């Protein structure tokens, strides 16, 4: 099963002895997730009165 080099591998971007701690770099395109959009439907379904400044 194991290749004859399993214990003596040179693994880049694995830290510490035994080379098993992961310190790789993340890749980030720019995607962002947020809540969904909505628009009101009931604005013409009422009688309207304005009392601004009075």
């Amino acid at each position: 099963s194991d290749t004859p080099y399993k214990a003596d591998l040179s693994r880049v971007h694995w830290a510490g002895s035994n080379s098993d701690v992961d310190i790789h770099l993340e890749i980030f395109e720019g995607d962002v997730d947020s809540g969904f959009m909505y628009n009101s439907f009931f604005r013409g379904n009422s009688s309207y009165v304005s009392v601004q400044d009075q």
């Binding site: 099963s1 194991d2 290749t3 080099y5 399993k6 591998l9």
Partner: protein
Amino acid sequence: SNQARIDRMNTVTIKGRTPGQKLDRESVKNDKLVITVDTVTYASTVMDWQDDWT
């Protein structure tokens, strides 16, 4: 001749691997088919000359 032949073959499988491990091998299989011709089919009729002339 009096025979015909056709060949058959099997398929393969997939596996997974992790760093440091070796790769396994697999064996394919095959067979054959044969068909033969045996019997003749016929129909026959016979008539006599004296009946033919009358």
